Structures are given as structure tokens and as C-alpha cells.
Structure 1
């Protein structure tokens, strides 16, 4: 849920915080944590390639299992559900009856103590991982692979799920959270159920410093810049034509997906915008 702060200070007037109801333990597994240092948006050359990034609280990486293929037919039980700075959703900790501890994205409705099983013979309860050919059409899944063996890449953020529309031949037609229809090989794996923290989007951060803790730096508008610095000022926009924005590097609006792409053969349809 969401806990709303009382307006005792202008920094917390309309603010709110995540009511960490689903969290069970406040510390990570020691063996599944890896070091992680910030970069500030600078590439190997040292130049800023992504702007507005830097600062922010120190964080440590939790090793997440996006490649659940090693353990088939080995049941596991969820030990705790806990916090992860690196992603929007919570992470669940699995104790395998085999004796190995792993981390996964916590799906919706998953409580402590449940049994998670993966393979071809697993049930269709939330949290179970199946190859796509064994998943009946019409169910909601998450953490879907793109190529058969490359690890989950799709529908990972909080409160996000995809609808397995159907199967045909070698390809299953899915709908992305964005809303488009995409085909993927039925030999890919996916986890049943949605993703937790559906109430993430309702957080009101409230003050500038709170967003600065999250490693985001302030953005300067283009109009208040000098013509040597930003191509705005010329062309206007507003309500005259369509050159409303120009990127700092001079590029106007338009489709940016590269035409003549291999994966274009797999796209049943693109997403739609504009009511």
C-alpha cells in the first residue's frame, strides 16, 4: 500500500511512501550480493553520454535468476520477500529442496511459504516457470525470453504483465505491456502471474532532494539556454506546426526505430497512441 505523510513541512505536504507491507526481511543474502558503483552517465571515454544522472545513494546488486533452466523438477519454497534498490519490483528468495538459494522477481499474490516449481510439468500457479509451449493460451505471464535460452527480458517492472494471445506453429503471439502484438518462439520460457508492487506508480516523492537521493540530477529546459547551446528558439512549435520539440542535437520529432530490421518480421503490429 501507500502511506501518506502528514503535511508537517513543505517538503512533505503531498508526499507519500511505499508501505513496505510485503517485505519480510530487511537484509539480503550475503552470498547473492555483488558490488556495484555508480557511473554518473559517463561512458568509457569519460564523457557524459546520458545526462541528468549522478549522485544518489550507494547500492549493492542482488543476483537475479532470469535464466531458470538449471533447476527443472526441483521444487523450491519462498523464504522471504524483500527490497531491491536496483529495480521497481520486490525480489523473492527461493530455497530449493536441492539446497540452493536463488532470487527471482516477486509476482503478485505470492506469500511466504508457498511452493514454486518449474519445468514442463509444473502447474499454472503464479510463480511457476514454464516453456511457452506448456502454458495454456490466455494466461497472464511475465519475465519472458526473446530467444530460446537468452534469459528473461520482457515484462519485468512492477505491476506489469503480458497476455499470451495464442500459439501457431513454432511461434506464440503475445501482447506486450505497451500494447503491441509480438511473436516469439514457443521454446522460450516465462513465469506465470503478474509482478508485485502494483501501487508503485502512485508514490508522490514530494521534494527535490528525495529524487536526488535516487540519482537523478536537475534538467534545464531548452528555451532558457543560449542559441549556441540548444536549437530551440528557432522554429517555435506551440500551435503552429509540428516542430514543437527539437532535441539538443537538432533532431526533430518522428519515428526513431530503425527501418529494415530483422525483428520487424516478428512484429504482428506496433503499439498505438492517441485515443
Structure 2
């Protein structure tokens, strides 16, 4: 049994591949609101979230539930946050996308109603509300897909704070090492051609090469699906 890949070790859940969950400030999600209910709240401070390398806003609501929130760009201290359908379409507000005008930017979008926010959460990403229909609504996601979402799926208006984070080159292996200390990722990573044949499909040989096509099928078993997984195409744009 040639040795299991790094993905199989990660899936097993060993301490090398586990996230340092105690380092993070708090799970980010929209506040729980009953149907046809609303709550107000004010920002008490902009903190730093190690899980995302972006700011998060500490919001104190009207029922006294101090809840960490994902910070859209421009949110400040002493700003009022509103939730519900009756909430005004304003930056930093949590509203359904069915009330948002088409062409606006939203983030922390919910896959389902009362979801807590799944899509559009990285530092600086945003979504565009494309079309409104009775049962649906189209949102142009940061990837580019025109995802169709429920009209009641909440989202905070504005782009996510911390835009431009990847503009700085890393410039040094220590800087990326210090980022990866607070991450779950393994750093540094050895190339598979440098491995022995027991460790990787691509390892071994008198000279560094895979010896087999790097585009692997989608029907490959675990421990074989490496390289270019199920590629539609390869190479730079000719």
C-alpha cells in the first residue's frame, strides 16, 4: 500500500492539518431573527479576525445580545445596524435580496432563508443583484456564476471590508509562514515529483517528471485524483 496522499492525511483529521480553532474570534453569521421580526444594533468596535485576516465588527443589538458580525467596507463605530425586511437598503444593513435594487453590491449572502450567510465573505469580495422574479432572484457571484437564490435570502449591503489584501506580494517565506501559523493549511508543501513512488502517483524516476498525464479523470478513486482534476482544458490562454 503506497503511502496515503496529503489529502487523505488531511481528511483523516490529524493535528498537522487541523485548524487552530481556539485562535479565532467568533463564528460569523447573521443574527437569528424570527419571521416578520427585526432588531437594531450599534457598532461598539472594529476588531481583527485571525480566521479571515479581515476586520469584524462587534455589534450590540437592542436585546443585549453582543454578536460579532462580518464587517462590510465603510462600517464604523457608533453606526446603527438594522435587520429585517423593513430595514432600509443601506450599507452594513441585513435585508433580503428581494428588496435590494438590481445593480447593488451585497455580501455574506445566505444560500437559504435564515441561513446565516455562506457566500461572498472573503476580504473585499462582493456580489451583484442581477434580476428579480417572483420565486427567484439572480446574484452575480465573485466567481462569475449567476447563482439563483430565494427572494428571502438575507445579505449585508456593501462589499466586504479588507479589500486589497492580496495586492501585496508575500515577498518572503516567513511572511507566508506567519499567515499559515493561524491557518489550517500545511506549510511548506513538497512537490509531488520530488516524492518517492510510494508517496505519490507522480513520484519516483531517475529524473523529475510525472510519467503519466496530469489530467486525472473525475471517476478516479481517492488517493489517485491528483494533478489536474477533471480539467476541461489546460495551459495558458493561447
TM-score (norm 1): 0.66
Match of 1:249 among 216, 223, 226: 223
Q: Give the match for residue 144 of structure 2.
A: 179
The equivalences for 1:48-87 within 5 A come to 53=17, 59-70=23-34, 72-87=37-52
**Contact 1:68/1:129 (8 A) holds in 2:** no
* Aligned CA distance change for structure 1 residues 196 and 55 (closer, same or farther; 3 Å): closer
Q: Secondary structure at the match of 1:133?
A: coil
Kept in 2: contact 1:54–1:217 (CA 8 A): no
- The match for 1:30 is none
Q: What is the alpha-carbon root mean square deviation over aligned residues?
A: 3.2
Runs ≥4 in structure 1, deviation > 6 angstroms? 54-58
- Aligned twin of 1:128: 93
Change (3 A) 1:180 1:230: same
Deviations 1:131-152 (A, max 9, x none): 2222122211111111122221
Using the TM superposition, give the Cα deviation of residue 57 of structure 1 relative to its aligned residue in structure 2, in angstroms.
10
Query: CA distance change for structure 1 residues 60 and 175 in 2, over 3 Å: closer, same or farther?
Result: closer
* Structure 1 position 218 matched with structure 2 position 178: no
Which SS does the other structure have where 2:166 is aligned? helix
Matched, 1:230 2:200: yes
Give unpaired runs (5+ residues) of structure 2. Answer: 1-8, 203-208
* Alignment correspondent of 2:205: none
What is the aligned partner in structure 1 of residue 108 from structure 2?
Answer: 143
Check 1:47–1:68 CA distance in 2 against 1; reply closer, same or farther (3 A cut): closer
Q: Alpha carbons of 1:64 and 1:161: their partners in 2 closer, same or farther (altered >3 Å)?
A: same
CA 1:110–1:274 in 2, change beyond 3 Å: closer, same or farther? farther
| SS of aligned partner of 2:175 | helix
C-alpha distance in 2 between matches for 1:55 and 1:164: 33
Count of residue pairs the alignment pairs up: 210
Consecutive unaligned residues in structure 1, runs of 5 or more = 1-40, 237-242, 257-272
Aligned residue for 2:83, secondary structure, equals coil
Question: In the aligned structure 1, how far is the partner of 2:78 from the partner of 2:118?
Answer: 27
